[PDB]
Structure 1
Amino acid sequence: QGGGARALDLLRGLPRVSLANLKPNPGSKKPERRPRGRRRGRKCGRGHKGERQRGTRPRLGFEGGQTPFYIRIPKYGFNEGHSFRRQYKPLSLNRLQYLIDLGRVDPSQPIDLTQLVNGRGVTIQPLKRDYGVQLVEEGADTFTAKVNIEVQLASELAIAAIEKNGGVVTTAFYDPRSLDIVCKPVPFFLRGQPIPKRMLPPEELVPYYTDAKNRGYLADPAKFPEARLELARKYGYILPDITKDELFKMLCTRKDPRQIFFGLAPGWVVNMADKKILKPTDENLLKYYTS
């Protein structure tokens, strides 16, 4: 009601918009400065003799011969091995809750990397050495949704917030190839390769993922009841019985350790053109993909 319509009706009485009466937005096209005329010619902004006017001053960091600042500081391994450190995109319980409240992540089904990427909840960069998402606690007080969520790292307080609401959380490892596939399935399927096996963690990560306190995906299921009970005592909530819930079957869904996608096995070829799936039946191949 106003300026909006006031512009289109103001256009009715103006000459036709053509290729002859266009112009850039004021302030968008700064003028070029050319070395011509009194102000900008003559020495042309370059000063008088020396190295600078002749374009031959030394490189960046050189100080005229004094041992330069960036060389006289001692080497220290601030950045040593930076390229082999694993990084985890943090997912907040504020951001997770927001994604569910806006309908971009569906809590009625299991939530793994594919659902978070497809809901545009996190952006994963395996080429920048991302190893998955770390579930961080920020927003734990106001988190109410019950989810079955699979991440790579999770804080105890983040786990408590999930499990206090009746949800389930498991931590699962993805190797960089498996991670790239799980993050963008369609581009991988357009390679026409059999679905590979998800590799195991490296040794240094085997203790994390075989530990029930982290809800590790290689951890002993019989040890989970105790660990879930400990956080409830620690943080002062009553552990719900999720076996009594109607979504209990959904809450129990976990990929096999060697499995990248729910419902698809290693060694299958997805034929998106014909909407078919090709399964090998050769024994040697079949033994390879189940091992």
Structure 2
Amino acid sequence: GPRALDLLRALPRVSLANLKPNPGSRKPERRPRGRRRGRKCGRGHKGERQRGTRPRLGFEGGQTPFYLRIPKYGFNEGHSFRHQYQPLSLNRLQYLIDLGRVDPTQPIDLTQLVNGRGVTIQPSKRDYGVQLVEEGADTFKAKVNIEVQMASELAIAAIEKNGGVVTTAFYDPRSLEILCKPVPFFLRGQPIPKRMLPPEALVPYYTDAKNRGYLADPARFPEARLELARKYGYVLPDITKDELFKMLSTRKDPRQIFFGLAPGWVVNMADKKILKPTDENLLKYYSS
């Protein structure tokens, strides 16, 4: 390929003896010696600056500092405690399906999004999960089963028009940590934890059919969903008559962190075996 090889035929052996760093890769380091850099050494003359003791950063020389005049105001207020939702465009989603990172074949949740490196979640930073925004709304062709943390109307509308099913789920911080990195969790050697219920402010969000929250009454799903089809003017596909209907139907227990696993089990990766307790108190604790 690289005609450089043919040049390498005629040249002497590469060794340690001849090695040249890229031109301008190293910038020469300057030292205060000689006529130019010596004699005040770029430090200026007397004053406070040549003794090196001049004041700290904000200091204005004694008039009231710029950063200390301005009144304070809630800006960064409670910034520790505001939930954060990593956005996911339908562009990005269509993209991940198209190049076949995520497969629409099996049900698509947060874990499989992480595994596709489509979205990076850091529970530790007060990040509560993925949200759905409508950027690829027109472009979007895929038939998908998605579970996000927060969704927008136009997003749900798009996924309907293509005949998929969206569902909103809430995870607490701990559950989210476990959900986003399942393997480093199993190597802890802890049981599989209970999933928390949403706190009080979020609860009104997850009981609505309009939202299609996981804690909502399924009975309203055939209603509100049809409503969405009127507004954006598409005909609603029949999910029951579909061939993949058994996958779309699949939900999680509100107390389950994982698909088909159960709260309280323990995964042993060495013997490739799952452990479940028979203890009455234990089983009551996890089953609740």
TM range (shorter): over 0.9
1:175 maps onto 2:172 in alignment: yes
Runs (4+) of structure 1 exceeding 6 A deviation are none
Query: Equivalent residue of 2:80, what SS?
Result: helix
Partner Cα separation in structure 2 for residue 270 and residue 107 of structure 1: 27
Deviation at 1:9, TM superposition (A): 1.1
Aligned mate of 1:241, from 233, 238, 242: 238
Partner Cα separation in structure 2 for residue 41 and residue 50 of structure 1: 18
Partner Cα separation in structure 2 for residue 273 and residue 27 of structure 1: 52
Deviation at 1:38, TM superposition (A): 1.1
Q: Deviations over 1:165-217 (max 9, x none)?
A: 00000000011110010000000000000000110000000011111111100
Deviation at 1:13, TM superposition (A): 1.0
Deviation at 1:34, TM superposition (A): 0.5
Deviation at 1:266, TM superposition (A): 0.4
Name the one with the larger helix percent: 1
Query: Equivalent residue of 1:39, what SS?
Result: helix
Query: Equivalent residue of 1:212, what SS?
Result: coil
Q: Deviations over 1:71-110 (max 9, x none)?
A: 0001011100001000011011000000000010010111
Q: Deviations over 1:49-92 (max 9, x none)?
A: 11111100100010000001100001011100001000011011
Partner Cα separation in structure 2 for residue 243 and residue 42 of structure 1: 87
Partner Cα separation in structure 2 for residue 254 and residue 27 of structure 1: 59
Partner Cα separation in structure 2 for residue 14 and residue 181 of structure 1: 57
Partner Cα separation in structure 1 for residue 97 and residue 258 of structure 2: 21
Deviation at 1:6, TM superposition (A): 1.0
Partner Cα separation in structure 2 for residue 281 and residue 8 of structure 1: 69
Partner Cα separation in structure 2 for residue 27 and residue 247 of structure 1: 60
Aligned mate of 1:157, from 154, 171, 195: 154
Q: Deviations over 1:85-144 (max 9, x none)?
A: 000110110000000000100101111110000011100011111100001111111101
Q: Aligned residues: percent identity? A: 94
Unaligned 5+ segments in structure 1 are none
Deviation at 1:273, TM superposition (A): 1.0
Query: Equivalent residue of 2:175, what SS?
Result: helix
Partner Cα separation in structure 2 for residue 228 and residue 185 of structure 1: 33
| Paired residues for 1:255-270 under 5 Å | 255-270=252-267
RMSD (Å) for aligned C-alpha atoms = 0.7
TM-score by length of 2: 0.99
Aligned residues: 288
Partner Cα separation in structure 2 for residue 15 and residue 86 of structure 1: 63
Unaligned 5+ segments in structure 2 are none
Deviation at 1:5, TM superposition (A): 2.5
Partner Cα separation in structure 1 for residue 64 and residue 29 of structure 2: 39
Partner Cα separation in structure 1 for residue 246 and residue 59 of structure 2: 67
Query: Equivalent residue of 1:49, what SS?
Result: coil
Query: Equivalent residue of 1:149, what SS?
Result: strand
What residue number does 2:115 align with?
118
Deviation at 1:226, TM superposition (A): 1.1
